[PDB]
């Protein structure tokens, strides 16, 4: 299917420290592969997956110069963000940046990103067309004015359409065994009765990759909702994911309901019942 290369950048003004701490993580799809933290005395870009370790020195040196680069920019943007809002030197502040490319099954660019948030709220963002910016308020609208004259949009566009996309392909090649595995869920249903009041059936999916999965409960064709608890999909800690969907059903009727599991790593959809 489609794939993505995404960097998640967090700069935090301490401010009982001369510098704010910069953290960057890089992902292909839902797998992390690189890391930069400003709080190392050596601070370099580091591998966080075995399949990136084959890159040679120049890959690590270029990444480190760029993260050094962007850390000093974001520090600057922290200082700038105080005055554009009349703000207290006492309080700690957060700048987040997400940028990356999202690419289709044939390698076309579908969506490119560069976007920013000050203390959890939009600030500025590159538009779907990568030729314009939407600024969240008057503070950001001046930053925009500056980025407009600078034609930084063209700098992002060119990165997102060349570098970002070409490297994503490379990463999908190098990490093939990890990133292109279609690893199916391991499934089972539990039952937990509750007096004579009906019965919690919980359908589980463990050990799957990628992240996207559908768990639904049906009876007589119809998806159920009423005492239907669905947890947020969650990392298992070994590159795989887990989730579950639980439904309260009447006593005696356990077998009228079926859990429907849809995943990339399954030949065809799966239908479970409690036994």
């Amino acid at each position: 299917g489609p794939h993505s290369l995404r960097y998640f950048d967090t700069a935090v003004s301490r401010p009982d420290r001369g510098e704010p701490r910069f953290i960057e993580v890089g992902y292909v799809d839902d797998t992390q592969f690189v890391r930069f933290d400003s709080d190392a005395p050596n601070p370099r870009m580091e591998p966080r997956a075995p399949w990136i370790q084959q890159e040679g020195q120049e890959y690590w040196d270029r990444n480190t110069r760029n993260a050094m680069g962007n850390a000093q920019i974001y520090r600057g943007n922290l200082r700038t963000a105080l005055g554009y809002y009349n703000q207290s030197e006492a309080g700690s502040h957060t700048l987040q940046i997400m940028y990356g490319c999202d690419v289709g099954p044939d390698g076309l660019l579908l969506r490119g990103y560069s976007q920013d948030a000050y203390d959890g709220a939009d600030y500025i963002a590159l538009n779907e067309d990568l030729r314009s910016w939407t600024a969240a308020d008057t503070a950001a609208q001046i930053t925009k004015r500056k980025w407009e004259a600078a034609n930084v949009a063209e700098q992002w566009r060119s990165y997102l359409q060349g570098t970002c996309v070409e490297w994503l392909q490379k990463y999908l090649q190098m990490g093939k065994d990890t990133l292109q595995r279609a690893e199916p869920p391991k499934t089972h249903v539990t039952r937990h009765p509750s007096s004579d009041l009906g019965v919690t059936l919980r359908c589980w999916a463990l050990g799957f990759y990628p992240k996207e999965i559908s768990l639904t409960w049906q009876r007589e064709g119809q998806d159920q909702s009423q005492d239907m608890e669905l947890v947020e999909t969650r990392p298992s800690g070994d590159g795989t994911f887990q989730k579950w969907a639980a439904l309260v059903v009447p006593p005696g009727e356990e077998q009228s309901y079926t859990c429907h599991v849809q995943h990339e790593g399954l030949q065809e959809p799966l239908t479970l019942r409690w036994d």
């Binding site: 890089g26 760029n66 920019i73 560069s114 992002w156």
Partner: peptide, 9 residues
């Protein structure tokens, strides 16, 4: 690959 961009703000 990370981006090398660039402008003051």
């Amino acid at each position: 690959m990370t981006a090398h961009i660039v402008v003051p703000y």
